[PDB]
């Protein structure tokens, strides 16, 4: 038995949805320190590994050392969509069902059976940025319609991001020289990766302020959205063949 | 010949459009006490009624007591001068049917539709014959949110009295809704007589709540143990649109 | 057919009679105290005493008051009535098996295999009568006839403790001689249009177009007046109500082909929808007898309801499901229907 009031709904059902691209159905591990959702789409493009620690959370409560629950993404998501502007969420869970409760000008509840989801596991990178994530998500919202594919390079520490698509074409530099960088060192490394998983994840923009972007050549990118406290959104993403 | 004048043309409009959430055609009704329409749907489990008294219009003139019949085409019309607008409406029959004109309030004008209709012939209004022994009040905005909640969740909603609140539950196999509706949060009004509770079909709830749309008035819903739901909301110009949902038993 | 009705006569109001027969021959009134103030409600039922004097079913409780202020007002205690009713109903079940029952004082047994003709019918109601005072010191009318709504009338004509048969004959009378209002069913709501429209009676709606019927109306119960008016209207008992409904149809050869199983499968979803008729069923299972007689059934719900083309549908693939699972030739194929979605219309709150 647990029980999590959500300090931030948005963040939290901006969080889920993105995961939702990739997982139909997911295990929220949940331990003292917080809750971990981890997972690999079916194309094996992409790892996900989100961590919220408990003080992502208020009045965070745990009976067990490690409990998991089995969920179906577009369920919770579904029901995510019913919070209401005043409302707080609650989520709490049993040996049965896990329920989504919405306090606000009254109490509503929402109840899902707990289902039996297949647990999942699995270095470094020549090349790591820091960058705002606002920043990433108007820069690939912007590519995303242009093309399947993006491809990253740097040279002398500048990050170019480019999408040659059917019709057109866009190229963009990201370095600490214009406003756009925080940080970024490395080799000169180039990859490919596939449009449609990057531009997925700029839903994390209403969950995170920074984020890290690591990559190198014929190697996953990494995307690491920095959320409050200890927490994370992580997303690998395999380089194109 | 029938001679009309309501004094708020929005609510007007209000009430054909609330109406058309049970049947596509509509038949107006014209009576000593004022104008009615009563409308089911094909399994009678929803109804739609419509009550003006002639003591809320402006003018009010029959010669006999008569029906009107507004087919689609009509009922489309006449949907398609709605407005927000304040003004008046007058509606007076034809040899073909109705003449409808809307008279702006502020400055000025007036705009005319021609209905082909048929007449005649008053049916009496029936509703259900039923003693309800809870009622509350609230507003469409708190409906809308447990019309969305239930049809997201079941095809089936169940309402009922626990202590002194109201309870709706709906789900199908395991996957379930609650809310507990009270005094304050968020009803404006809640009377139990005795406790009891009743199961209707969420998709006619939904209907009966759209049909609220445009009507600023508190919402009256009233039930019984196993008995119809009654929804009825006053319009700020007077008369009355109400809802019956039969229950499942 | 031969149709044997039990109503129990003023029911509540009697059991309270039998548990306090210090109460006998004074008005006795059962009420249902709701409601908001004192005295708010109505009466339940009262006993012949109070009916005299127009105390009634459904009167309000203050009304009843100020016309019989010193009769004996007692609170409806449903359990009670509830109790001494199954104890009945049990008892009636010993006559018929094959029994309706259709409120918590009225059943309908079909006899039409247990008696001869109408006077062995009679006598059996007399035997019945007499058992039910026996064990439960209550009095019932018994109404004997071809079917359900001719024995609900013989009822009618004969309580309190009465006994009465509508044979062949007296049915062909009460067609043409009867207040249609006085026809079971029909609410004065229907009838009191038919008193202006110069039907006064049932044998009157066979000179009405069937078109004009629907009506005033409403094809249900232009159906159900016209085949009483005709004498056609038969019955039948409606014993207990089922939770699954459907067929089972034994192939004549064992297969695992789904071209030669579909036509039997199919057939089984037809003869299957006659019988849910109105009912909507939420969940449909396939079920397959093996060569060596073992049962293999899947099924799915469906959240709305399942109409014939889906079960059509979903039915080849739960037996395709059950093909892929189970290595077996197939002997019996057939479909379950259960969950049931049951709309009552608004209809049944108007009357009367």
Known sequence: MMKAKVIDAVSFSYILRTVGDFLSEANFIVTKEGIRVSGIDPSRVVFLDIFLPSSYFEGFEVSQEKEIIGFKLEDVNDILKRVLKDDTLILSSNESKLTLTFDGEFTRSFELPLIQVESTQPLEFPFKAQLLTITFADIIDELSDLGEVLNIHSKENKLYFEVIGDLSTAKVELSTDNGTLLEASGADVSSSYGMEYVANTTKMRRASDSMELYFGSQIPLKLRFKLPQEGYGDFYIAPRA | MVKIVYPNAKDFFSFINSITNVTDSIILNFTEDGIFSRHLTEDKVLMAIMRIPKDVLSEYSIDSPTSVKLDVSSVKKILSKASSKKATIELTETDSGLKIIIRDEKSGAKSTIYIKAEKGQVEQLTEPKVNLAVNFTTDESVLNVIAADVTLVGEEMRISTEEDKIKIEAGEEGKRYVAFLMKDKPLKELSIDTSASSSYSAEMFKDAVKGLRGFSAPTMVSFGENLPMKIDVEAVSGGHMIFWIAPRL | ?352
Do not use: W
């Open chain 3, 1 to 352: 057919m031969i149709v044997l009705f039990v109503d129990f006569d003023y029911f509540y109001a009697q059991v309270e009679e039998v548990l306090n027969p210090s109460l006998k021959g004074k008005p006795v009134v059962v009420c249902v105290f709701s409601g908001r103030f004192e005295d708010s409600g109505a009466v339940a039922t009262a006993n012949y005493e109070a009916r005299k004097f127009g105390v009634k079913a459904g009167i309000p409780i203050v009304e009843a008051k100020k016309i019989l202020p010193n009769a004996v007002y007692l609170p409806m205690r449903k359990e009670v009535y509830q109790q001494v009713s199954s104890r009945i109903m049990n008892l009636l079940r010993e006559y018929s098996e094959k029994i309706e029952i259709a409120s918590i004082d009225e059943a309908y047994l079909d006899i039409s295999d247990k008696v001869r003709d109408y006077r062995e019918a009679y006598n059996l109601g007399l035997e019945i009568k007499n058992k039910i005072l026996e064990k439960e010191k209550i009095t019932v009318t018994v109404g004997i006839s071809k079917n359900k709504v001719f024995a609900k009338i013989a009822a009618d004509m004969a309580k309190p403790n009465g006994i009465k048969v509508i044979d062949d004959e007296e049915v062909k009378r009460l067609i043409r001689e009867l207040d249609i209002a006085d026809v079971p069913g029909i609410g004065n709501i229907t009838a009191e249009k038919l008193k202006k429209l110069g039907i006064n009676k049932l044998v009157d709606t066979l000179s009405i177009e069937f078109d004009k019927l629907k009506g005033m109306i409403g094809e249900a119960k232009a159906k159900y007046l016209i085949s009483l008016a005709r004498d056609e209207y038969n019955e039948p008992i409606r014993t207990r109500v089922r939770k699954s409904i459907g067929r089972i149809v034994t192939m004549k050869r064992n297969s695992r082909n789904l071209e030669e199983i579909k036509p039997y499968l199919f057939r089984a979803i037809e003869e299957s929808y006659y019988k849910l008729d109105k009912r909507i069923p939420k969940a449909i299972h396939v079920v397959a007898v093996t060569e060596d007689l073992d049962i293999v059934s899947r099924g799915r719900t469906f959240p709305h309801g399942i109409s014939k083309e889906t079960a059509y549908s979903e039915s080849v693939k739960l037996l395709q499901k059950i093909l892929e699972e189970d290595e077996r030739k197939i002997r019996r194929i057939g479909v379950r229907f259960s969950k049931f979605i049951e709309a009552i219309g608004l209809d049944k709150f108007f009357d009367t």
